[PDB]
């Protein structure tokens, strides 16, 4: 068999590749994952930093 014959890939290929669209759906999901994890990182840091503020008993004697 010759090396110029490409094997069968028709189980996995698209409608038409349509590069306007194949990039659309992959990067909406990569953008959503970066949005949620940047919000989550910001809640984690503010939870740890606020623990260093004045406690309830110190504010009661304020």
């Amino acid at each position: 068999k010759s090396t110029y014959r490409t094997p069968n890939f028709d189980d996995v290929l698209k409608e038409n590749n349509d590069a306007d669209k194949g990039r659309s759906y992959a990067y909406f999901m990569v953008g959503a994952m970066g949005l949620l994890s940047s919000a989550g990182a910001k809640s984690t840091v503010e939870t740890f930093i606020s623990s260093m503020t004045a406690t309830a008993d110190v504010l009661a004697m304020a």
Binding site: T47, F48, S50, S51, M52, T53, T55, A56, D57
Partner: protein, 385 residues
């Protein structure tokens, strides 16, 4: 060349994180080592933010932890995350070790990597024990009493070791203040052993589920196995959050909300769930000195496995008999935990004795005999005359 390859510091990140060659066929069981590294970061960070509000004096200790819960902003999040984070750290480690036992990762050329790991395990049981004592409730006092009095049986030298460990004549204030300072330290020693552990992996790299060479088909780490590891990071955080926020005291004992009292003994002194199988091995030996030796021998019999496996094939994937006895050993390890949470009564006395034997016979009698039988069956099935 690229900056990531030329810089002194980024060259190490690139060689370990970005361009590292990995076998194409490794599965999700190879993701546990990543999680154990996030676990250690969770515990060290949460612990340092609590240490700002903790007092180690025996008359102030229990009330400092209740003060973190009531008066500190988001302090109930720090403790429950921290307390349940240790239960999760131990569960991922048992699965990491059981994997290596199944796929033969202890064998040469990776004997040095297995031995540094056995050290990490010992130093991790020690850390957790020291921290539970710093709460100083009623399981904290009587758990330290039972374990520290074991060293008074060493010949001629024992009663000097307990009084030097206590700082006195009983579990008292000097004991609780020294256990907190050591409990802060040992996590930084575990981190230094984790770096030495990774250096020994870089030499030969990782194995694979088939037990053959992986030098013919390799994939880089970045953007195949980085994104495969995000999958299990978010599942770990989800299940942990479900315990911290909705069921935060199911993996504990109620007696440790009673403050510690030397004059009233509890009706049942029971360790956490992850030290129960080793606690059943100790209770099974009638003599005090032999019991404390047999318990520590249960951790260091793992070092004998590279010399007792007598097989020419690595791993259990193609091995029928060696699969059956791998899962006998796993469920015998779950019964030892159950028996460690029971009263010392018939028939739970003999059950823990027979099961302590099966723990030791696996490493020393079963593996050598089935490995040799399997080798000879492979031969006579192909070469038959």
């Amino acid at each position: 060349m690229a900056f990531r390859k030329s810089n002194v510091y980024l060259s190490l990140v690139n060689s370990y994180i970005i361009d590292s060659p990995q076998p194409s066929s490794i599965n999700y069981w190879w993701n546990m080592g990543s999680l154990l590294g996030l676990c250690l970061v969770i515990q060290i960070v949460t612990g340092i933010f609590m240490a700002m509000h903790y007092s180690s004096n025996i008359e102030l200790a229990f009330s400092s932890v209740e003060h973190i819960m009531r008066d500190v902003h988001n302090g109930y999040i720090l403790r429950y995350l921290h307390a349940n984070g240790a239960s999760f750290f131990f569960m991922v480690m048992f699965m990491h070790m059981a994997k290596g036992l199944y796929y033969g990762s202890y064998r040469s050329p990776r004997v040095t990597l297995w031995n540094v790991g056995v050290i990490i395990f010992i130093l991790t049981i020690a850390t957790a024990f020291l921290g539970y004592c710093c709460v100083y409730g009623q399981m904290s006092h009587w758990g330290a009493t039972v374990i520290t009095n074991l060293f008074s049986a060493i010949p001629f030298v024992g009663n000097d070791i307990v009084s030097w460990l206590w700082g006195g004549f009983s579990v008292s204030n000097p004991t609780i203040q020294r256990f907190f300072a050591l409990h802060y330290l040992v996590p930084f020693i575990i981190a230094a052993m984790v770096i030495m552990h990774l250096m020994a992996l870089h030499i030969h790299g990782s194995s694979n589920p088939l037990g053959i060479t992986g030098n013919l088909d390799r994939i880089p780490m970045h953007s195949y196995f980085i994104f495969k590891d995000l999958v299990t990071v978010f599942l770990f955080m989800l299940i942990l959050a479900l315990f911290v926020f909705y069921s935060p005291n199911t993996l504990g004992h109620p007696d440790n909300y009673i403050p510690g009292n030397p004059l009233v003994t509890p009706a049942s002194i029971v360790p956490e769930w992850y030290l129960l199988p080793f606690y059943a091995i100790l209770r099974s030996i009638p003599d005090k000195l032999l019991g404390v030796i047999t318990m520590f021998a249960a951790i260091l019999v793992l070092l004998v496995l590279p010399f007792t496996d007598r097989s020419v094939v690595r791993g259990n994937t193609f091995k029928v008999l060696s699969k059956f006895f791998f899962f006998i050993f796993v469920f015998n390890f779950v019964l030892l935990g159950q028996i460690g949470a029971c009263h010392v009564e018939v028939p739970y006395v003999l059950m823990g004795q027979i099961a302590t034997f099966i723990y030791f016979a696996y490493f020393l009698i079963i593996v050598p005999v089935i490995s040799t039988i399997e080798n000879v069956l492979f031969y006579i099935g192909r070469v038959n005359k």
